[PDB]
Structure formats: structure tokens, C-alpha cells
Design an enzyme around this catalytic site. Sequence first.
Site, PDB file in Angstrom:
ATOM      1  N   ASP F  55       0.843  -1.189   0.000  1.00 36.47           N
ATOM      2  CA  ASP F  55       0.000   0.000   0.000  1.00 36.47           C
ATOM      3  C   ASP F  55       0.882   1.243   0.000  1.00 36.47           C
ATOM      4  O   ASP F  55       1.732   1.407   0.882  1.00 36.47           O
ATOM      5  CB  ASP F  55      -0.929  -0.010   1.213  1.00 36.47           C
ATOM      6  CG  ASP F  55      -1.934   1.129   1.195  1.00 36.47           C
ATOM      7  OD1 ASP F  55      -1.978   1.884   0.201  1.00 36.47           O
ATOM      8  OD2 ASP F  55      -2.685   1.268   2.184  1.00 36.47           O
ATOM      9  N   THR F  88      -4.977   4.881  -2.500  1.00 33.70           N
ATOM     10  CA  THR F  88      -3.874   5.752  -2.104  1.00 33.70           C
ATOM     11  C   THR F  88      -2.699   5.634  -3.066  1.00 33.70           C
ATOM     12  O   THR F  88      -2.028   6.631  -3.362  1.00 33.70           O
ATOM     13  CB  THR F  88      -3.428   5.422  -0.679  1.00 33.70           C
ATOM     14  OG1 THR F  88      -3.000   4.056  -0.615  1.00 33.70           O
ATOM     15  CG2 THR F  88      -4.573   5.633   0.299  1.00 33.70           C
TER      16      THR F  88
HETATM   17  N1  LIG Z   1      -7.062  -7.522 -11.054  1.00 31.89           N
HETATM   18  C1  LIG Z   1      -6.886  -6.305 -11.622  1.00 31.89           C
HETATM   19  N2  LIG Z   1      -6.704  -6.177 -12.955  1.00 31.89           N
HETATM   20  C2  LIG Z   1      -6.529  -4.973 -13.532  1.00 31.89           C
HETATM   21  N3  LIG Z   1      -6.519  -3.813 -12.851  1.00 31.89           N
HETATM   22  C3  LIG Z   1      -6.692  -3.794 -11.508  1.00 31.89           C
HETATM   23  C4  LIG Z   1      -6.888  -5.070 -10.804  1.00 31.89           C
HETATM   24  N4  LIG Z   1      -7.031  -4.773  -9.499  1.00 31.89           N
HETATM   25  C5  LIG Z   1      -6.934  -3.425  -9.377  1.00 31.89           C
HETATM   26  N5  LIG Z   1      -6.729  -2.841 -10.572  1.00 31.89           N
HETATM   27  C6  LIG Z   1      -6.579  -1.383 -10.805  1.00 31.89           C
HETATM   28  O1  LIG Z   1      -5.648  -0.836  -9.870  1.00 31.89           O
HETATM   29  C7  LIG Z   1      -6.143   0.386  -9.318  1.00 31.89           C
HETATM   30  C8  LIG Z   1      -5.829   0.439  -7.828  1.00 31.89           C
HETATM   31  O2  LIG Z   1      -6.355  -0.722  -7.188  1.00 31.89           O
HETATM   32  P1  LIG Z   1      -5.742  -1.269  -5.802  1.00 31.89           P
HETATM   33  O3  LIG Z   1      -4.333  -1.754  -6.046  1.00 31.89           O
HETATM   34  O4  LIG Z   1      -6.753  -2.213  -5.197  1.00 31.89           O
HETATM   35  O5  LIG Z   1      -5.662   0.032  -4.855  1.00 31.89           O
HETATM   36  P2  LIG Z   1      -4.243   0.671  -4.436  1.00 31.89           P
HETATM   37  O6  LIG Z   1      -3.573   1.021  -5.742  1.00 31.89           O
HETATM   38  O7  LIG Z   1      -4.618   1.867  -3.593  1.00 31.89           O
HETATM   39  O8  LIG Z   1      -3.561  -0.433  -3.665  1.00 31.89           O
HETATM   40  C9  LIG Z   1      -7.637   0.430  -9.593  1.00 31.89           C
HETATM   41  O9  LIG Z   1      -7.991   1.691 -10.169  1.00 31.89           O
HETATM   42  C10 LIG Z   1      -7.912  -0.688 -10.579  1.00 31.89           C
HETATM   43  O10 LIG Z   1      -8.398  -0.145 -11.809  1.00 31.89           O
END
Ligand SMILES: Nc1ncnc2c1ncn2[C@@H]1O[C@H](COP(=O)(O)OP(=O)(O)O)[C@@H](O)[C@H]1O
Lengths: 541, 51, 538, 155, 100, 520
Positions: F55, F88
Site C-alpha cells: 500500500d 492511495t
Molecule cells: N485484477 C486487476 N486487474 C486490472 N486492474 C486492476 C486489478 N485490481 C486493481 N486494478 C486497478 O488498480 C487500481 C488500484 O487498485 P488497488 O491496487 O486495489 O488500490 P491501491 O492502488 O490503492 O492499492 C484500480 O484503479 C484498478 O483499476
Amino acid sequence: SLRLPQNPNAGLFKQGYNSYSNADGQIIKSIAAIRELHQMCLTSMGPCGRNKIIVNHLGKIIITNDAATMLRELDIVHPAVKVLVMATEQQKIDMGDGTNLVMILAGELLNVSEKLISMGLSAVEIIQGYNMARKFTLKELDEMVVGEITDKNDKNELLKMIKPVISSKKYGSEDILSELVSEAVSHVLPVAQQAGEIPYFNVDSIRVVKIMGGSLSNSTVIKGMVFNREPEGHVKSLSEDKKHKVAVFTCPLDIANTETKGTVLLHNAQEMLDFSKGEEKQIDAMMKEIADMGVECIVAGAGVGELALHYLNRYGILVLKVPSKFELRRLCRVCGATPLPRLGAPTPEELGLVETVKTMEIGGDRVTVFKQEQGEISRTSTIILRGATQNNLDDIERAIDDGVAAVKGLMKPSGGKLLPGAGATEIELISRITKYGERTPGLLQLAIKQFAVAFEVVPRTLAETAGLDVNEVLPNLYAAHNVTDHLYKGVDIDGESDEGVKDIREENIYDMLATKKFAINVATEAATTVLSIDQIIMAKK
Amino acid sequence: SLRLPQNPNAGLFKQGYNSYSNADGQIIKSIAAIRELHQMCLTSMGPCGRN
Amino acid sequence: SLQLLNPKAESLRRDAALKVNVTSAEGLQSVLETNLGPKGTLKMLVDGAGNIKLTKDGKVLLTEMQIQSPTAVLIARAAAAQDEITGDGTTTVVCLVGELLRQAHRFIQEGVHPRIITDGFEIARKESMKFLDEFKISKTNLSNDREFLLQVARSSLLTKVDADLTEVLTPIVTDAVLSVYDAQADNLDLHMVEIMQMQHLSPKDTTFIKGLVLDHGGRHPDMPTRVKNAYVLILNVSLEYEKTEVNSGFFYSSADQRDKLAASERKFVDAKLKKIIDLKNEVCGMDPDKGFVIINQKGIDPMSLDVFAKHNILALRRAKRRNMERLQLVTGGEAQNSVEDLSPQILGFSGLVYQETIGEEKFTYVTENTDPKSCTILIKGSTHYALAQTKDAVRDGLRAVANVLKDKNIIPGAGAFYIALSRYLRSANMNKLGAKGKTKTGIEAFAEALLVIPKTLVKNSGFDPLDVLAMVEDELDDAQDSDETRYVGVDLNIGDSCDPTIEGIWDSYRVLRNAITGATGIASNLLLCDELLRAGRS
Amino acid sequence: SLQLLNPKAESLRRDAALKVNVTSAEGLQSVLETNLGPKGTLKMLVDGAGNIKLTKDGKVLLTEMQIQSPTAVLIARAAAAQDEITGDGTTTVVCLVGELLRQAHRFIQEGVHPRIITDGFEIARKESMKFLDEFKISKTNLSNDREFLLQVARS
Amino acid sequence: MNFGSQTPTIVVLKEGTDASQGKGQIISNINACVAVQEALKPTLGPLGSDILIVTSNQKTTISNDGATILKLLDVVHPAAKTLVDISRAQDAEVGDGTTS
Amino acid sequence: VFMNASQERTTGRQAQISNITAAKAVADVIRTCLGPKAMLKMLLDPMGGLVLTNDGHAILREIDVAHPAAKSMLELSRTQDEEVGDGTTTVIILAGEILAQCAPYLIEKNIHPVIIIQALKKALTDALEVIKQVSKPVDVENDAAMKKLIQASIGTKYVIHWSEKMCELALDAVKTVRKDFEIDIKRYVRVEKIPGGDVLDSRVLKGVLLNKDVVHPKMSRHIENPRVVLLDCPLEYKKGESQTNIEIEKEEDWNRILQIEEEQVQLMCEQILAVRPTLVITEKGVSDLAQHYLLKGGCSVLRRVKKSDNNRIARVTGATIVNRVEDLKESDVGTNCGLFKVEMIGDEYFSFLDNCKESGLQKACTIMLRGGSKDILNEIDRNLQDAMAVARNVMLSPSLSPGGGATEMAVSVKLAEKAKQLEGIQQWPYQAVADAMECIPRTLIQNAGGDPIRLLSQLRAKHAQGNFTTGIDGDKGKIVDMVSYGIWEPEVIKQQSVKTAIESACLLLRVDDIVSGVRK
Ligand SMILES: Nc1ncnc2c1ncn2[C@@H]1O[C@H](COP(=O)(O)OP(=O)(O)O)[C@@H](O)[C@H]1O
Ligand SMILES: Nc1ncnc2c1ncn2[C@@H]1O[C@H](COP(=O)(O)OP(=O)(O)O)[C@@H](O)[C@H]1O
Ligand SMILES: Nc1ncnc2c1ncn2[C@@H]1O[C@H](COP(=O)(O)OP(=O)(O)O)[C@@H](O)[C@H]1O
Ligand SMILES: Nc1ncnc2c1ncn2[C@@H]1O[C@H](COP(=O)(O)OP(=O)(O)O)[C@@H](O)[C@H]1O
Ligand SMILES: [Mg+2]
Ligand SMILES: [Mg+2]
Ligand SMILES: [Mg+2]
Ligand SMILES: [Mg+2]
Ligand SMILES: [Mg+2]
């Protein structure tokens, strides 16, 4: 959890070695490092460019806008800058013109590659994109030449070559500096009806002797050479002797002695009385044969003894030291004589002719004038500069050296022709590279489109250094090429630039075709090296 | 060649920590370390022992 | 790009960070590599203060010695938490995490992504749980077999100490957990068994006691040392100088009042003593043969000790707080805070009460109870580190036996569980598993890493680990077609295989389930960490 | 027992020196493995005087960069001797030495003694020399054809 | 991939090199010439006053004209050396008005 | 010298270049922390602990970055966490690319920053309308729809293996705290962790988990219907605000002082026995004398309790905190307590309070977690806070935005179409915003190992014709639609990513000069 493992490779190699590799840095990082020196050259580009003061550790100050001269005196720790520094050094040594274009063009090719690498384009396909775009660029430069000239003789034909180069450096003087170079070239070239077979020309035929004080307009052109020395033994005879034979002797004037160290051996006092008059009559025999040939001037590179100077003063024969050997062959080309290491007697075929010799003070210091009128000179001349400061005359000498370098690059090959300047050629190359990318589909289109974007820095630098908006005058310049009269559109520097269009044929601002071909090949290869180096290895200190 | 690798991955513990094992004659050095204070009490043994 | 964010910072990423987790876990496992097994090496720790810690437990090595490498800190906190709940598995998790990183490091160099490697670890671990149901053997507690508790207790004893201290401590631990099992089936490990360090005779003379032992004894000489029948009265109230509430004080008009007000200090003390005397008037029957003792949680005023001496009442002060909760289990009475309400029902019962004075310290012994609900274990040792070596050996054996009575199943030891997973994971069809393609490779790295523990046991015995497992795999090949189900172990004495069920080698159920689950999460987070940096405000 | 001879003497015995030979060769290989092949990386050697040298060959890299680790010195002197007679194979030998150690180090942790490991190297190398004679193809150089020399020189 | 520990960034110019650009550099260059001019302002005119200068060798030299005054002091700043060149060029060529 | 100032003053364009380069290095560290294949980053604090997470919020929080402009990027991490809690890492990567992609100029074009800012404000307004058009509303009462929504933030974490179990824990925790609009807060959600155990055995249990064993052995550890009464006052003898300073003339007065201290505490115990509570919880310490009269009546004594736990106990059992024992009434006594039990764990004791589950005040619940170590517990706790925060956005904002990089790419396509129609001097700053929006889906390709040139080229072509739900697949690195991909993300997460990144970029563009170490 307080201390790091220090990595196992820490013991490998040494602590002084530093590593920059892919994903480890560099990759548009080091490209952002040269932007500091790139912006330094952007302000020095064009007739409105800004000079830069550089103080070496020795204390000498060199003020010039030439990128090859500035980057030479600067100590730069960043290695990849030396790739660009050595790229500008090749431009000065061989062609001698376009050093500012190589540093600016190669710097923008790395800047336009910032978007390419950010999109995931590998550096392997980037090299192939610039190589295929460079070959298409050199092939399109021939059809744009309207300035093909077969003369290379008349003085007015040099106004489209030497004068545009002088327009950039020391823009405050145009007809004054152009007349000094154009008249010096007319003297060093032999007079003939038709001169073929590429007559030899070198940068040593035109020289620059800088004298402090006096306005630049008071400068003139002298067919001979001006050296600072002290004449000895008599005042010159002015024109009373008219053309006088000048003998240039490599070895000094004195009784010939062996290379090994000798000494006088006197067994009896009978040889002591003849030892005084012996050395007098021995050297007088060789000095008497010179006066019989009508030689009024003798030049001996090494030091001349007082015994030899005694005889030459009564006959009215000039003696000049000329300590440096490089300038010794230059006086020989004025009179057209053959340097003779032997003394002997002067032969008529090996003696030159000088119209007159005088000693005057241009700036308050006595110098000897080799100027020869009505005489025959071969590949020799000089330019006397008059200025209030020494640093201002330093770049003027480099501007003259760059002016005569264009003549060398014009004369040696078949020709240098001409190209439209003031941002006219760089904009035309944009439409050629842009349309070239759409003809061949593939992944190289990204590198071809960005290759034409780097050409936008040259025409806008003239507008940026003129206090103009690059979002108005520059976009209005592309619309002027919509369609001959569309190839002559260029950038205007003036308070009247609001229209943004001035005809190039009015002021006749042209660039050499051979200069742009050599500048692009060096700038493209310099930017290719930075992108082809995956890992950097440093060392301690 | 000039300097040793100086026992890589030794940063796992503080520099003051030392490891001694039965191998490399340390179990012999431990027995030899006993003989330093052993002879001290040998001359003190018996009614003729020395204080 | 970190040098631009901070003037001075240290960071290692990608291949630089990949060598961090692999090499640091390799040096930590090598320290505990010679530890694993009953023939393993014995380590002594000596700090700068002069203390000596001699034990084979891997948890003491991690807590006493500091670790600069942050990778082992994650392993040390994982190995420490394994011994907390399950009382075992400290050196097992270290060998699992350190080896699984190296087994998966070879394919990382081959170009395989770390995520698809760690994804295969979860697929392979979930099969170890499904196989664990058929691997475990059910044991019914209704049989009350004593021999079964003997063989299980010797698993942890033979590892820490030799057969000399094992034969002595085997019936002691079994007799301790025997009283733990009740019709309620609830097992409370802390109140039932304790470890009391006392230096007497030799460590091999350790004996078992069926009643609570205290560190305090009678201060007054006339207090009876040995009392046949004693009624233990639990008193949590202290008779002594109180805080006095900001010390208001007394003011006397005449010298006769000065001594008259001084007697008021004994008015509150003697007020609670009359209630004890009234309670003694009920039990006064057979007073010479019987007796009355008092155990207080807090110090008792020496001014009032002479009152209990005339009545031959043994007084104990400054007792531990946990010892107050066990007086109901040992004697059988109840706890009494206020002395206003007293009854004979709350009084305990003891068949033998005696005190043994050794040196300056005096200890009180209680035993011979009708239906004792708790017992104790008196640890004797020659040296300070000998008390800690037995303390870590007995305590680790407590959770091993206590976890057996919690569930109905038991896991055979001697590497029978790790070898069975190797043949199961390698011969299982991948279409049944959720892992496909490159994720098939990550499962093989988990199965091969489990075979190092049975090989690590052999490294301490001197035999070749490769040659001794050749006969184990050849026995399991013909056992499937012969219609015979038998578990094959590893015997380090003769360098051959054995049967953990016949030899008596058993392992707890909660230890191996939490070890594999714990070791998988540690190694997975380390393989997924591509960068290690240090930043902070100090 | 070495410090008893000299106070300043240091040593690493058994696996202490074994981890060095595996790590130092792997660390040296990791730097030079990126130079193997036509797509390999380009190294820029910069000394204290400011000289820049771009080469993908391991002979110049190991010569300009002094190696502190004694283990990698044997590999550098072996790659240097490979460049003397054959003029080629500097990067190849470095990649093989570090790989032979890592593959053999995995069996050492399994209880295999290094003596029998060295036996498997000599027996398998002699069999590779016999296969080298059958795998190679003889060519006729009497024709002096250009097409055959252009492809070999281009590689 | 890195050699060891952390690698600090390499400064383009050599450490210790003073470099500044923009309009603030020209103002600093003009103030260097004005500060030198402040000493030669009272010297202009027939009523001008002489300047006493003592060098590091304790050699007393008194000169009214600005040509020799600039020769006594050792000038460091580059822009202030420009006023020295015009004083020596005016002295050698003519010799009058070196202060003006 | 003058004041406190100078040294080396960075002026001109190089002051903004240093602001762009330093802020770009912030997103380069967590650049690999985006996507389902994202790696992990281990942090070393000066206190001696360890923080390992993917994160970007927790990574940028502990890292100490000294720089005027680069610290502004660190403040953006708490902007997404405190307002939402999800996205974030996306905000830092987006804001880091916007400053680089939207303002390479002024190094070249010499465009004034405010002229660019005026285009950023118009680009933010149009970007919100594009997100509203591509957002399809989803029912909040569907349990099957909320499970796939919580798995959005789970797919990029380590708990994706337990995602089937994790969505059960996150859905029941948000629904319980939700009070009927439908405003919930995580101050009542307990982060307490249990070392060791199996993740599948972890479950959300109603009530408050206390670490303290019963005080007295005769205290019943098993109660069918516990009755809980909260007391802020200590059961000990209160000394008072002013000193008593009793002057004792006669010897009988001193014994009465110590006798009242027993009866005064007894008087407070008799008033408690009026409501006959089975379990008595005291915020402060308790004397060993007060527990006897409470044990005689059946009351249970516990260790002193922190103020944070007293508020959660009152919500579960419906009890009201009563400071004054004399004012204690049967109306403030907590009832409807399911079970009271104590389980043995080697580290500490644990006391369980179960709710009878059967509008009123919002109920409180604790989340039990069984990990493999102490640091694994802290990683899942940060994963639960990110997963449970997703359910808070859908309840307040039923709108549901496209995920998988489809939101940022859909805006980049609309900005490129309006860039040619706008013309003017603002066309360059307006078109440069679309180039920064496509960097987030480009990171998904770089982490997956695919070719971003060919994938993003077909993504933009299939976006206009095919649908607005087309996006990048995380695992396979292919071109798929979010309709069949089955994972979606709330619009509040996407709106906070666009607003915070653009509003922060306008602050760094206005910087002229930088002076360090002026004074404190
Ligand atoms: N399995 C996945 N495949 C493609 N894109 C993803 C996937 N999971 C998350 N994302 C993309 O990554 C971005 C951030 O998601 P996430 O990683 O859960 O939050 P953070 O970046 O705050 O850790 C989201 O906008 C989403 O579009
Ligand atoms: N008076 C002028 N009006 C318009 N353009 C000019 C004028 N003087 C020079 N230029 C342009 O400025 C440019 C300066 O280029 P320059 O640095 O001299 O090229 P090179 O590096 O090859 O010498 C020339 O291309 C010329 O066209
Ligand atoms: N006498 C023995 N013979 C064979 N195997 C044993 C013997 N003692 C212990 N083991 C094996 O060693 C393993 C580790 O045991 P132990 O040391 O009690 O746990 P840990 O290594 O986690 O501290 C067990 O799985 C057991 O099978
Ligand atoms: N007799 C005079 N009357 C008026 N002005 C004078 C006279 N003599 C000199 N000046 C002025 O004073 C200035 C300074 O002259 P001076 O100091 O003598 O030499 P310099 O000009 O070399 O400094 C000159 O510019 C000149 O114009
Ligand atoms: Mg020029
Ligand atoms: Mg054990
Ligand atoms: Mg080769
Ligand atoms: Mg004057
Ligand atoms: Mg998320």
C-alpha cells in the site's frame, strides 16, 4: 532490523565503483542531467545568442558562444556529457562549422525519446528508428538546394557563405568582419582564368593578429604577416630598394661548429694573434657572398651571434629572429622562397621578393609589417583586429577561424552549395520525416514522429532569443508553407516580426549543405550512444 | 586478493557476537583453558597445599 | 531515484533485494540446522552481564541475541509466536522459511515471476490440510491409557536432554497432566502446572509433588514445622502498616495520653485476629493432632506474628498472586477476603504439611490431599543455567502433552508427515489442482523443501542424508500394493527407517498445522518483496 | 587455531569459504551475463582520469576493473587466458564457472562430498570431447568462397 | 545489479564550480563594474583627487589616472576585468581619457 | 551577510524542474506497487520495527523524505486514506505523472503556469462528467453483488487466496456498524489481533474481546444471560480533592477511620447489588476488599478498562455508562448478552461477550484474526481497512465506476477528442492531461510483463467501438471487458483520484523560488 545486509556484491569490485544500469536509474534521468548544459547552449544559439564566461583553474577567461570551445575548458564529471562534448569536438576539427547545432540537435533527440521509453519502447528499436530516419534526411537535402554556384572566386559570391556565418557570431558587425575575411580569401587564391582540379586550400593561409585598442571599423587586410619583434642594426630603406631579395635561413648565422662540444686548442702564441682576426674573416667570407646577390633581408630562426650581426648592419641587411618554427614557413610563402639550412651563397631561384618592409606601432607596440603590394603571394594573408578588450577579440578570432573554415569545407569537396537559413530548412525537414513514417507501417513510426519533433528547437530558438512567443510565430510559420515561394519562409528577428514572415532572399542568409549533412550524422550518433549504453561503470575520484 | 570477503552474511548478528564450535580445535582450547586454572588448585591440594 | 528524495539513504531492490531474503534466511537456518533433532548440538549463551543461558531451544537463541538483518526479524517473530501458542515449532518454522526461499530462488533466477511461485504455495498447502484429515490417527480419551501419554511426552524430552533426564521427567509430566483431565474436559495449563526453580542436590533428583509448594516459611521459631492435619485459611487482607491516608496523626495532651493513643494501632490489628480465634474455636477438636495454618497474599506485620506463635498457627506472608487461586484446587476450600464472615466450609484440608529449610530460604511443602484438583512440579538443578535448561525442557513438554488431550487426534513424528507430503504432491494430478502452467512449478518447490527436515535429522547423526532416504522411498512403493498401511519414520541410531507408532514417536496436531500455515505466509511475503530500504526521522 | 600463529591472520573454514566461492562467482556472473549475445548490454568504463570505453567483451572489463574478491580473480585470470589463445570466449567461461559452482553447491547441502562431484566433471567432460568430434562438421577451405566466410565473420 | 550499498548522484559540473544563470547574473555583473567605477568617479576632472593604493608587497604607488589604478589591484570578477582592458587599451593607443 | 537567506538560491526554470523531478521520484518507488501482480516493499523504521506492505499509503508515511516539493506528495497519501481509504497508491502515481506529463513545457514552450492551471480546472470538470456517464448503478441490497465489490481491493493484496472468506468478514462488519443516511465509522470497529491460528478459523464475533481474566477464582466464567453494568468510578476508597486531616483526640477514633473505609466501600457495593448485575466492569482499578461483597451477591469484577473499550461495550449490550453508584438504576443495566466465556491462550487470557442479536443505536463488533505471525496480522488488518472502506462508498454512493484501468482510459479518450475542438492557447495543457491518465493502465501492463505499445493501441481503438467497459486484464495481460471480468470499483474512489491529483499539481506549478533553513 537496524542495519542493512550491505548486499553480497559489496565485496565484489571496490567501493569506489558506481553502477547505473537499466531500472537502476539513467533512463531519461541522465537525459535530464544534460538539460542544464543543454539550456546553456540554447541561450548561445543564433545571432541573439548569449556568450558565456568560463574561468579555468589557470585563471584564463574565454568568452564565446561556441559550444565546442565552452565544453572544452569545462571539467565535467558526468561521463555521458563527454559523448556530447567529443561530438562537438569533431565538428570543430573537421568542418569547423555547426558546433552549436550538433549539441542542440543531439540533446533534443534524447528529450523526445523520453516519451518513447515511457511508452515501453525498447532502446533496441529506438536505434533503428533514428538510423532509418537519418538516411531519409540526407537524401532529401539535395532537392532543396537553390544556391548551387560554380564560381567560388568573385568576392560577391562569398556574401552568401562567409557573411551568414559571421551574422551569428558578433552580430554587431556585418560588413566590417565580412570584408576582412572576403579580402583575405581573394589574396590567398591564385589569379588565373580557370583553376580546376580542386586547388589546395588550408586554414593556415588566413591568420589573425590581435592588437589592443582601436575601433573594429579601423581594421584592414594585410597581404603579408604582422609579427611583434625588435628590428636591429638600421632603419628600413622604404621603397628606395623596391623589390628586395629575402633569404630565409633555418640554421643561425655563425661559423659552423660540430654537434659535439669543441674548444680552442692553442699550442703556441703565434696562433693567438691570428685567433682574433681568424674568426672575423671566416664569417665575413660567407656574409660577403650574400651582399653580392642583392639580399636585403636575412631571417635566421635561431639566435644570431654579435659577430654575424656586425657585418650585416653596414650592408643594410635586415635580420629577424622568428623564434617559432610554425610562423617561419609563413613568411616563406609571402616572398615565395625556399628555407635554406645551409649558409653558402643565395641562389637566384631560391630567393623571394618583398615589395616593402616597415616598422610601425598599431596599438603602441612596434611590429614589423610584411605587406607586399604588386607582388605575388601564395596562400598567405593576415587580419589585424582592433578592440578595446581582449576577451571580446577572442571570439572574433574564432568567428574568423569559423569563416575561413567554411571556405575549406567549400573548396575541398565538389562543393558545399547552399541551404535556406533562419529556420527555413528545419521546418521543411519536419514535413518530410512526418510523411515518411506513414509510408512504412510498423513499430518504428513512434521513433520517426519524435525524430521530426526535435527539429522544432532550431527555428524557435531564434524566436525565443528575440523575445517572441513560440506559440504564435512558430505555429504561423507552418501555415506559410501550405501549397517556389513556400520554401523561403523563415523566422524573423525584429520588432516587425509580428507578421512572422520575412523573405530569406532579401538578406541572403544561407547555410552550407555539407555542414548540415555532417552535423546531423554526428548529432544522431551522439544521441544513439546515450540510449545504447545500458549500464554505467564509474570509478573512485 | 588484497582484502578478504571477511565472512559474508555475518551481519545477521551484532559484531560483538562470536561463534565457537567443537570443530576447529575449540573444544581442545576449552580443555586447555581449564588447565590454566587447574594447575592453580593443584598446588593447593592436600595438607602441603599452598595458599 | 531515492537519492533525490533523501540526502542520505540506503536501499536495495530487485536482484539486490532478492539476495537479502535468501542469504539472511540461509545464515539463520544454518544456526538452527545443527539444533534440530535429539542428537542436535547444544549451545550456550553468555551476555556481557555474566548470565549464562544453556538450552537447545531456538527461541532463546533469537530473543537473547540481537539480529541486525530485517529479514530474520520477520522469521524470529514468527518462530517466537509459534512457541507461544503451540509450545513447539520454533526451529521447525525457521527451517521451513529458510529452505522454501532457497528452493523457490532457483526458479526466480530462471525468469519465473515471484507471484505465480507464491500462488503455488497456497495450492500445495491446502492439500496438506485435506491430507491431514486422513493422515491423523484418532485417539479416544475414554480408555485413559497411561502408556500413550508416556511415549508422547518423550518426544520433546529426548530432544532437549538425554535419556538420563528423560526417564526422570517422563512420569513427572504424565502425573502432572493426569490431574489436568477432568469430567469437565477443560484443560487449564497455567494453574495446573508450575515451574519452581530451587538448587538442591543434582538435577537428576527432580521429583513430583502432589500439592502446592510455596517459597515462604514460618518466621517465628515456635511455629510448628510439621503439622499432621492443617486447615488452610485463605486471607487476601494484609495486617501491617497501611498507607494511613496522607498521615494525619495523633495529638496527645499529656504523657499518659501518648501511650494511651499508641495502643490504638493494635486496636485494628487485634480486631481481625479475634475473628481467626473464633474460627479456631470450631476446629478446636483434636487440637494436638490437628492444626491450623494461615496463608496470606501480602506481608504480615511482625508485631502480630507472636500471636500466631502462642496458638501454634503457621503464618505465610508475601505469597504470589497466582498461588492464591490454586489454594482452592489443592486443599479444596474457598477464598476469604473479609474476616467478618467465617465458616468451616471454606477451610481446606491437607494430610501432610511440612517445611524443609535449606540455606537462608525456607520452603513450605503441602501434600497428601483427599481429592487434589491440582499439583506442582519442583525443579531442582545444580547451576543457574541448569534451572533454565530444565525449565525450557519441561515447559515445552507441557504444551505437547496438553494439546493431545484437547483434540481426539495425534500426529506421528519421525518425519513421517513430511515424507508423505512429498509423494502426495508430486504424484497428484494437476487438473484436480487449481494451479496450471508455471504455477505447477511453485508446488514442486514446496514439496522439495519439506524433505530437508528429515535430512536435517540425519546430518546430526553423521550418516549421509541422501542414502538413508533411498530405503524410505523404496519401502513406500511396495506398501501400497501389499494392502498394508504403515507409516515409515527415520531412526538415527541405526541409520535406517522405523515406525513412529511402534517406537512411540508422536507430534502434536496444533504444532504442524500452525507451522506450515505460519511458514508459508512468511516466505510468501519475502518472495513478493522486491525492494528493501531504510528511512526515518532520528 | 590460526590466531595462535599470528594475531592478524584470518581464515574461513569448510562451508565458511564454500559460501564465498558460490557467492563471488554468482556476483561476477550476474554482471557479465548481461553482455552475452547480440542483444547484450553495453558497459561504459570510466576511470579516475575520465576515459570512456564501450565494449561488450569481458577481457577489457575485467582488466580495467580491479577485483577485490580473491575468488573472482581466478575467473578473471581464466577468462584472460581464454582471450589470449582463442581471442574469444571471455564471457562464456565466466558464465560457466559460476554456473558449475551453483549447480554443485545444491548437492553439497544434500550431504554430497565435493570429491565425488569433481569426478563427475572430468568423466562428463571427456564424453563431451568425444561428442565434439561427431558434432563438428569438416569444411573445404580450398575453394576460398566468400559466402562461407561472411556468415562466420558476421556472427 | 548494483555494485554495493547505495550509489550517490553524480553532479554534472565539478564539485566547487560556481554557476548561475538568469537576469540575476547580469545584475551581479553590472554591480561589479559600478563598484569599480565608484573609485574613479572623484578622480575625473582637473579638481579630481589621487588614490593611494598599497599592494601585498607594501609597494607604495600613487596614480591619478584609472589605467594604473586598475593595474595595482588584482581583479577577480570577470566583468570587472572588462574595465581594466579598456583602460589599458586607451593607455597604449592614446593614453588620455583612460578614466573617462 | 543579511538576515537568514541566500546560500544557493534556485531561481528561474530550474526551480520548477527540481519540483517535477523530485515529485516524479515519489511515484517511481511505488510504481511497482500498482496492480494485482504488485510486489511488496519492506520499510525500516528508526524505532526498530518492520513494515512490509504494497500500500502506497503506509510506504510513503514511514519513509522520511526531505525536500520542499516532494513532501507535498507525501501529504496526498492521507488525503485518500482519511476521506476514503482506497486508492492511495493510484493517487500518488497519477499526481506524479500529471506534473511530468502535463508540464514538460516551460522547459520548451515557456507557457505560464496559471495558463496551464486554467486548463486543469476545465479538464477536471469534464473528467467528472465522463466518469458519471461510464458509471452504472448497482443494488446495495444484493449480498452477491457486494462480495464481488469488496474483492476489488482484495485482488491486489495477499488475502486474495482467502478472498472468499475475506468478503464474509468485511460484509458483516460494515452492515453491523451501519445505522439507519446509513452513516458508519471505523472508530467502533476493533482491529484487535490474535497471534497464530488459521485464517479460515478467524471470524467476526459480536461484542468486545477483553484480554483480562476474571479477578477471583469463584467468579463464574460461564454465564447464560450476562448483565453488564459499566462504572467509571474506582471501587477503591476515594481520598477526595482536599485533604481530610483528621485530628484524633481519643484512641477509639482512629479505629473508626479504618472501619468506615471498609463500610464506605461496602455502601457502594450494596447499591450495586440492587440491580444484581452478573458482570461489573470498572474503568479504574479495584480494591481486593470491594470484590468480596460483590462476589457474595454474584457480581463479577474485572481489571481496569480503557475509555476506548467502554464505549464499545455500551453499544453491544445497550448499557449506559453510570459513574455515580447511587444513581444506578435498572434502566441503564445492559441486557441481551449471548454468552460469557474465557479461553486459554499462552500469551494472555481472553474474555468473550456474545450478543443476542435481537431500531436503536448502532451495534459494535470486533474482528478476530488468526495469522501466521505478528507482522502478517498487521498486513491483513491494513487489507481489511481497505476492503471494508469499499462497502462504505457504495452505500452512500450507489453509483459504480469501471475498474481495471477503464476509468482513467475512458477519460483520456474524451479529452483527446475535445482537445482538437477547443483549439486556443489552452489546447496543449488540456491535451497533456489525457497523456497522464493512460499511465495508470500502462503500469498494469508493465507489471504483467506484456507489451504496452500493442496493448494500449488496441485498447484505445476498441474503447470507442466496443464499449466503455473495456480494460486491461491483470493476470493474463490481455484485452477484456469489465462486464465479463466481474470486478468493479465505486465512483468515489475514482473521483478522489482525479480531484486530489489535479488540485495538488496546481500547487507545485505556482512555486517560483525555494529557500531552505530560514528559521524555526
Ligand atoms: N485484477 C486487476 N486487474 C486490472 N486492474 C486492476 C486489478 N485490481 C486493481 N486494478 C486497478 O488498480 C487500481 C488500484 O487498485 P488497488 O491496487 O486495489 O488500490 P491501491 O492502488 O490503492 O492499492 C484500480 O484503479 C484498478 O483499476
Ligand atoms: N540577421 C538575421 N536574421 C535572421 N536570421 C538570422 C540572422 N543572422 C543569423 N540568422 C540565423 O541564425 C542561425 C544561427 O545558426 P548558427 O549557430 O550560426 O549555425 P552553425 O552552428 O551551423 O554556425 C542561422 O541559421 C541563421 O539562419
Ligand atoms: N528420537 C527421535 N527420533 C526420530 N525423530 C525425532 C526424534 N525426536 C524428535 N524427532 C523429530 O524431530 C522433529 C522436531 O522435534 P522437536 O525438536 O520437538 O520440535 P522443534 O524442532 O520444532 O523444536 C519432530 O517432528 C520429530 O518427528
Ligand atoms: N582646463 C580644463 N577645463 C575644463 N575641463 C577640463 C580641463 N582640463 C581637463 N578637463 C576635463 O577633465 C577631464 C579629465 O581630465 P584629466 O583627468 O586631466 O585626464 P583624463 O581625461 O585622462 O582623466 C577631461 O575629460 C576633460 O574634459
Ligand atoms: Mg556559425
Ligand atoms: Mg519440540
Ligand atoms: Mg565472441
Ligand atoms: Mg589626462
Ligand atoms: Mg486498493
